[PDB]
């Protein structure tokens, strides 16, 4: 069935799967960090546990597409998250933005590769399911970071609690 | 009907009933302290009045089991709570954690006794209705304490109000 | 907020709380005695477990009123019930009547104190929530005692069973 | 599939199946004895026919677990019940308690064996589905026996009828 | 909040999280292998994708418990699955059984550790959420393997199709 | 109440109860054999577990009739099933037919006895609840055996699976 | 239309109609005896008035069958019941059993006649609508008699009342 599907794109898709699964693992670690009894911000834990699910769904979508095109999924080891402890809510949100911008750059790099290989199905796939989702998420995180930094500028403890209660918790 | 039910476990079960009823009485005192017009934290009062009910239900469960096994319930005087006034919300939550950890230790001690006497019904009973309930409650209280301490670090009065309104009250 | 609320009434209200909680504890012991496998009268157990709840509710009502008036709740040790074993159904009902008449006398004594201190809120509170409830309960217990004594006059075992099945159980 | 499942536990489980099926057969005989036109206590017949079903369900649960663990069910002859006629209601209830205590002892013996063989699945299985069920049933039978003996102390015929009508029949 | 929670159990729980997440990753690879256009067994893909979810849920449950006890989650790299291609349906089912038996052994090892450290909450937790789930799953896989081997003994291609259509697909 | 009910029929009815209970036990063994992880034919297990229930119901009906007529139920030991392992699906179905034909012959023998003793209630009872049920069941089993033998003539493993999936399973 | 219908069976059917109508009249007398203000057992009156209806329905069924076969109904005088007063509840139940056994014997005699005349429609008719109904009713009456005799052994007046209230009345 394989048609117009380069080995370069096939390999890049496998690398992107690894990146999405790595991101999901990072968000799992963020979520459980905020579930610690000495951290205890349920809204923040929920926000990150939801993102862990969204990243896993992205990997799954890439894998389904890989098979649709007749490429072969190849899994690699998943690196552990970059930190064991994630600091304050603004620290964590900054780390999440860095992470999402790195995924976004990988998406843009793959889109450029597909464009060079004249693979319009790949380009459409990324546009339909990834590019706008990423931009929306990065905007949301940037808005959150602005709100948290505004809050913790005034008084740190009070600010983090108010943000978790009035923006994140549902 | 009595079978495989030691006098040691029977007596220890009666002591545990006293401990649970003592805890219930302590939570009654905490609840009404937060109902004072010069304290006036309704969410906190409700949290403790609910725990007074949960402790009483635990005593009742122990008593029902005592009869099921053919042991004999023996009631003792109930000591009054350790304080008449309970201070600030963090003071009260710390006292509650100390209390719950003491009940938990008594549960673990009884489990060890049942294990030594080869009383698997007793061990199962504690596992099914007490051990996890206690761990969950202690986790919840620890989370609350972290949130209150974070809040009152910034500004004490404001912090206590915000916690009562946005975490406890329903 | 305190207005027209004497220290004498405040202290007497605290003593009445202790009496109601003591009564609740007595009814808990009666209820579990009738739950023993060698006693086994479920209707009787239920009757007393329900009264344990009603007495606790009375204490709670007194405590709420104490705070409403700006008095301060002070808890004391709770004495254990007067017996460990409660005999036959008529023995138990007689003990319950003695108990309820002692609470009633304490209510009448407090009403007289409130009347002497010209505290009409206290008098109304006792009238609305306590005086008639007590009279109704004492009447019910007296009716039960007459029925049980009539039954156990004929044949003791048969009588106790019939009373539990046809009057108490639901 | 077999893992951590000793030959000792496998054989003991087969013996316990035989014991439960023997008990079921005993309750079948009790039920039909009370269905005799010259005995004629429908409530008593129903109570025992229901227990015959519960014992069979216990055997079935043991057999399902045997296969789950990769053990092999081995059936043996089922001994007939110890009596052909079961006497009065108190005679029958006493025989039922003796029977249930013998099953309970077999459960405790198997639990001890599983504990010695470090077989926590077996221990959990007995705790979840057998230990508390047995204790509850023995308590119920003990309560019934107390009620019947209280009734037949007064007048035998009248007592047995009243018990069947007002406790057992539904 | 930490009470009766050893550093040995804390570390072993972290290792078990890694094992469950590794298993989930293995099942993800199995699922997508059966989704290849040159393999194309949808029922088999679904069976393994469902198990990938169940393993992830197990890891999540362990992490929640770790925090409940006041332990600290520590994540490690996740090894890639042992194969890139999984052969025939019987090959894949055999590999799944080997995997599940390895998880089961790790559960039994942790239970033994908890038992030695006198940690009854840990033991109950494993019994309630892991031990029986594993035994049930291993039984199901063993049943599947017997059916597939019976089918592919007769005629390989026909057998694999029939199994996927009539046992797995829904 | 006994009228026109011979001692010969009474004894023969007791023997028939034993035969039906023996048959029920045989079907229990067949059912669990097909539940073994190395046999694993759920449809076959269900078919036999359902027949175990039907045989038990037949015994129960005989016992109820015994009491209705004023006869006395007398239980004997129940012999274990003739095999521990039941072979292939056709082996098992053949054994079931042999069993049912033996019950049928016992029914015909009892009918002949009732006819000789001029016991028309007995004859009607067997006609209403046993004779046609047996003929229908034997026909069903004969149809199943023809289908299984037709299937395993072609290819044994494939045949047994197809029969279990497309005839028996629901 | 008459076919295979002997004059002997025709006459015997007419005699059986007379017997059923006589029985109905007897039950009418029993019912109204228990309705006397100086007897006053409503449950007993209802039981017998219901049987008067059942006997009349039996006569009606015989008459319909007589016409179906082309026989000719011939009515005779109906003898009054054997007593004007029926004594105690056990006296009445004994008389009812004697009555029902006499009807049953007449049914058995007619069945034997039909069998000798090779009249299978007659035999089937008696089996379908009479033989089992009679056996069930006799069993019920025997059970009632056992219960009443057990009750009046203890204390006569109390026993009769309890039986009427707790077994018969609805």
Swiss-Prot record, chains A, B, C, D, E, F, G:
It is found in: Cytoplasmic vesicle, Autophagosome; Cytoplasm; Autolysosome. Residues 3-152 form the Ferritin-like diiron domain. SUPFAM superfamilies: Ferritin-like. The keyword Acetylation applies. One of its GO terms (molecular function) is iron ion binding. GO terms for cellular component: autolysosome; autophagosome; cytoplasm; cytoplasmic vesicle; ferritin complex. Residues 50-57 are annotated as: Catalytic site for iron oxidation. Keywords: Acetylation, Cytoplasm, Cytoplasmic vesicle, Iron, Iron storage, Lysosome, Metal-binding. Fe cation binds at residues 50, 53-54, 57, 60. In horse spleen the light chain is the major chain. Oligomer of 24 subunits. There are two types of subunits: L (light) chain and H (heavy) chain. The major chain can be light or heavy, depending on the species and tissue type. The functional molecule forms a roughly spherical shell with a diameter of 12 nm and contains a central cavity into which the insoluble mineral iron core is deposited. Interacts with NCOA4. Belongs to the ferritin family. Stores iron in a soluble, non-toxic, readily available form. Important for iron homeostasis. Iron is taken up in the ferrous form and deposited as ferric hydroxides after oxidation. Also plays a role in delivery of iron to cells. Mediates iron uptake in capsule cells of the developing kidney. Delivery to lysosomes by the cargo receptor NCOA4 for autophagic degradation and release or iron. This is Ferritin light chain. It comes from Equus caballus (Horse). The lineage of its organism: Eukaryota, Metazoa, Chordata, Craniata, Vertebrata. The gene is FTL.
């Amino acid at each position: 069935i394989r048609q117009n599907y380069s080995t370069e794109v096939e390999a890049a898709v496998n690398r992107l799967v690894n990146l999405y699964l790595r991101a999901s693992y990072t968000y799992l670690s963020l979520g459980f960090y905020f579930d610690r009894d000495d951290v205890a911000l349920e809204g923040v834990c929920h926000f990150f546990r939801e993102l862990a699910e969204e990243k896993r769904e992205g990997a799954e979508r890439l894998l389904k597409m890989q098979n649709q095109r007749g490429g072969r999924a190849l899994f690699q080891d998943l690196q552990k998250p970059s930190q064991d402890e994630w600091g304050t809510t603004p620290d964590a949100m900054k780390a999440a933005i860095v992470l999402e911008k790195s995924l976004n750059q990988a998406l843009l790099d793959l889109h450029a590769l597909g464009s060079a290989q004249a693979d319009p199905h790949l380009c459409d796939f990324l546009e339909s399911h990834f590019l706008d989702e990423e931009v929306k998420l990065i905007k949301k995180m940037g808005d959150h970071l602005t709100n948290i930094q505004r809050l913790v500028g005034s008084q740190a403890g009070l600010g983090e609690y108010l943000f978790e209660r009035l923006t994140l918790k549902h």
